[PDB]
Amino acid sequence: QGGAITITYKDDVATLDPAIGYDWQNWSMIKSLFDGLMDYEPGTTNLKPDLAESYEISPDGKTFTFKLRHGVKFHNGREMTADDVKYSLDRVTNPKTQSPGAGFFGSIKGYDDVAAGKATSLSGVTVVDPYTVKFELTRPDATFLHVMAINFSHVVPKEEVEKYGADFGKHPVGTGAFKLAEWTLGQRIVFERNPDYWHKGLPHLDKITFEIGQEPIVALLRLQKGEIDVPGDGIPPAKFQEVMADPEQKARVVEGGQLHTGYVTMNTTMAPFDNVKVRQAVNMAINKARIIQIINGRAVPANQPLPPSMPGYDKEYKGYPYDVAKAKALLAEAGHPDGFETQLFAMNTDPNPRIAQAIQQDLAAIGIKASIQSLAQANVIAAGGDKAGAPMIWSGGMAWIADFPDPSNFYGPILGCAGAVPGGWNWSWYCNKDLDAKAAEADSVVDPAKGAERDKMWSAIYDKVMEDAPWAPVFNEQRFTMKSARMGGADNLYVDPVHIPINYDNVYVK
Numbered sequence: 001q002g003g004a005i006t007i008t009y010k011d012d013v014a015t016l017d018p019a020i021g022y023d024w025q026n027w028s029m030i031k032s033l034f035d036g037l038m039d040y041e042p043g044t045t046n047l048k049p050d051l052a053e054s055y056e057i058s059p060d061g062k063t064f065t066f067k068l069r070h071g072v073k074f075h076n077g078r079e080m081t082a083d084d085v086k087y088s089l090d091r092v093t094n095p096k097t098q099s100p101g102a103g104f105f106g107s108i109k110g111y112d113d114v115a116a117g118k119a120t121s122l123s124g125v126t127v128v129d130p131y132t133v134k135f136e137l138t139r140p141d142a143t144f145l146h147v148m149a150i151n152f153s154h155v156v157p158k159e160e161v162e163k164y165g166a167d168f169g170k171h172p173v174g175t176g177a178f179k180l181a182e183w184t185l186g187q188r189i190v191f192e193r194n195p196d197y198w199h200k201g202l203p204h205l206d207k208i209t210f211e212i213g214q215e216p217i218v219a220l221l222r223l224q225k226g227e228i229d230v231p232g233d234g235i236p237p238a239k240f241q242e243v244m245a246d247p248e249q250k251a252r253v254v255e256g257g258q259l260h261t262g263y264v265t266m267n268t269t270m271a272p273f274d275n276v277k278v279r280q281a282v283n284m285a286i287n288k289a290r291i292i293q294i295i296n297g298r299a300v301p302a303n304q305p306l307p308p309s310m311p312g313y314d315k316e317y318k319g320y321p322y323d324v325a326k327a328k329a330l331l332a333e334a335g336h337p338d339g340f341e342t343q344l345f346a347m348n349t350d351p352n353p354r355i356a357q358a359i360q361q362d363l364a365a366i367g368i369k370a371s372i373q374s375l376a377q378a379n380v381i382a383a384g385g386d387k388a389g390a391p392m393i394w395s396g397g398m399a400w401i402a403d404f405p406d407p408s409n410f411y412g413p414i415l416g417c418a419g420a421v422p423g424g425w426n427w428s429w430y431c432n433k434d435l436d437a438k439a440a441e442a443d444s445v446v447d448p449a450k451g452a453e454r455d456k457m458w459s460a461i462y463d464k465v466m467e468d469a470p471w472a473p474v475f476n477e478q479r480f481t482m483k484s485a486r487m488g489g490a491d492n493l494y495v496d497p498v499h500i501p502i503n504y505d506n507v508y509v510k
């Protein structure tokens, strides 16, 4: 009940639009300003109705009917109704919105017509009455309920989108537990409790202040002084062991496993990375153990796209060897015995400039001279979302943590054709239509007793991805969160698997 906390970040926020935001800094911010039909029990991945009060599924699993809560108000005071759910889904799937999450809705009837520009409304989403919205699917979809909890299906008010247009992401209006109060660009973002939030008793805090442009190391000092509550950029490597060995700081640390993989993307449409042998050479060039030492051993080396604890992870897959001689030999086969020059993009928050320097040295060992383009995250992400931009990107600090705990989440948006779109997060621009179809087939296996078979279908998909080498996977990272002594709540609210980073709506001050 009450309290005003402070959270630091070095990088800035470019958007709070739920159709657009997708990075580690704004994902949970957006979840606190907006709501969708579904959410999760705080601290877990257990689905629960949110803006829906209840729902029904047809026996064939292709018709979802949601009964909406009554009396839900947007921050502007207007009642939310089923028309707003329809509008939001029509908007996020419309290609002109440039949502990196449009593909999550591919199983809805009429999606293809919308994606192809033949329709501006999803035929499969119908407003039955002001408080009933129905979804009809073309195929069973094992991740549909999770997608009705993902930011991209959060509900926006069309009159506010019309008012601000492309600038709606700077003026978010939602139904969520907090509303935007102050946004001083490059300096501070203030969330205030929404006093009329439909979920009574939430949030607990009165105010969250995000202080921008703050050095990660200084933030630890401020936390020791009680002048901030959460260092948003976590524990810098230079300070990790000292934090761990100081009981008065170790007591502020919460550690959690993640469904995470960090990787180097290669743009499969930009020469020279349009040659599979060049991409496989890069896979054999990276010294993952050395990179992991930079982050204090807080990770294990990744040999494939899925995190080791994700269902579908190929436990047997051997992977590309770390083998400079083989990498050079492959580069020569590809017509580059003398190597080549290229660009490696990275976000500029520690430790990612240093990790990029390590990758750069690894590439130099096989004859690739890569200049590091160390930029703000928004500009790395935008360059990735440009088919003609970013030959290589180190994903550290930006991607990928599963939005929901299923192997499908590591495909569509980052390795599927659905993500190889303007503004997308498939920075490899890797589009394999045959795998897209196999992915839809795998997500149609909905019988929970067939989960093992479905996990192996996904393993087969990622086996093929790995053969085409659009990624060089590097590591699977542990999460370390720091919180001030006054911050109450269970550990799993500070390493929340869904409201990534912190569950802003359910933490509290003691």
Ligand SMILES: [Ca+2]
Pocket (backbone or CB within 6 Å): 031, 032, 033, 034, 035, 036, 176, 177
């Ligand atoms: Ca919410």
